[PDB]
């Protein structure tokens, strides 16, 4: 009863800040996990030659691109913040803007982390294969480019979601 009515009320600015920051944090975490997987793969096959190291460097470049996308998302969220006056932080329009910003951050960061993990696993398998067969390098680069394209698609989704806020 009373708790049900209470649950509705929330502070939009906290949600906006969470959308600004947690998405970048989760993207960084996913990129770190992918980089760790790639580093483990490179350590496994460092015995033979550094071509697998070059492939892992391409994977790390993809992770750095994901990190740059997260940084750009954070900068946009800093810019995308509505007027949201300290006094006027209770309007339903402000709540809608906060919900939209939180949805944008959730869609961005989670997809970025999933893409980073996928890229890390694919890069590990690719480094193993490149260590196995010298010829097979372009195929590995294809999977790396696919992971980078997934990250770029997530970045584009964040860019589209940038124009969401409607707070006063």
């Amino acid at each position: 009863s009373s708790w049900s009515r209470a649950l509705v009320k929330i502070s939009p600015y906290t949600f906006s800040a969470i959308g600004i920051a947690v998405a970048i944090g989760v993207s960084v975490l996913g990129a770190a996990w992918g980089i760790y997987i790639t580093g483990s793969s490179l350590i496994g096959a460092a015995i033979k030659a550094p071509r697998i190291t070059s492939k892992n460097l391409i994977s790390v470049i993809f992770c750095e691109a994901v990190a740059i996308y997260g940084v750009i998302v954070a900068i946009i969220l800093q810019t995308k913040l509505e007027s949201v006056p300290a006094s006027q932080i209770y309007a339903p329009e402000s709540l809608r803007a906060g919900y939209a910003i939180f949805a944008s951050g959730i869609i961005v960061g989670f997809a970025n982390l999933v893409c980073g993990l996928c890229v890390g696993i694919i890069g590990s398998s690719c480094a193993l294969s490149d260590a196995q067969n010298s010829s097979l390098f372009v195929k590995i680069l294809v999977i790396e480019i696919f992971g980078s394209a997934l990250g770029l698609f997530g970045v584009i989704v964040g860019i589209i979601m940038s124009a969401q806020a409607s707070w006063p």
């Binding site: 959730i106 989670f110 997809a111 097979l136 997934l150």
Partner: protein
């Protein structure tokens, strides 16, 4: 806002379905590495499904972009029933999409094993992959119905 959050979740659920299918794409690529270890033609053949799976996620991103374009809440006011309907339908679509992505990853691993071996039922493996992709497309299409099912 509760209706804004409901519609946003309705879209982000299919978004998370695409993100989950990215895991099946990763599994397909992992299998593709071993498949192409045998031969580079098999490498290209197995890599193509990974590119297709990534294109599926790109399409999901495009759908999310369309949702963001339509995200304006001034045009339509959504009540408790509307928000609940949108969120539930989106969640069902996302669950279907994630399940399809997992099945696609399993089928991709099996096809990678087959390509590592002789061609044999490569057509059958491609048919199974096409069935998984068709399930994913059916989920994506069913998402549009709930997206358009709003208003008085």
């Amino acid at each position: 806002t509760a209706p804004f959050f409901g519609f946003l979740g309705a879209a982000a659920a299919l978004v998370f379905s695409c993100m989950g299918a990215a895991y099946g794409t990763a599994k397909s690529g992992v299998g593709v590495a071993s498949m192409g270890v045998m031969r580079p033609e098999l490498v290209m053949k197995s890599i193509v499904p990974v590119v297709m799976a990534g294109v599926l996620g790109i399409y999901g991103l495009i759908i999310a972009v369309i949702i963001s374009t339509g995200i304006n809440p001034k045009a339509k006011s959504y009540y408790l029933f509307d928000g609940y309907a949108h969120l539930s339908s989106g969640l069902a679509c996302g669950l279907a999409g994630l399940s399809a992505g997992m099945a696609i990853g399993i089928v991709g691993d099996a096809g990678v094993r087959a390509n590592a071996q002789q061609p044999k039922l490569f057509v059958g493996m491609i048919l199974i992959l096409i069935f998984a992709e068709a399930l994913a497309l059916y989920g994506l299409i069913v998402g549009i119905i709930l997206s358009s099912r709003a208003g008085q």
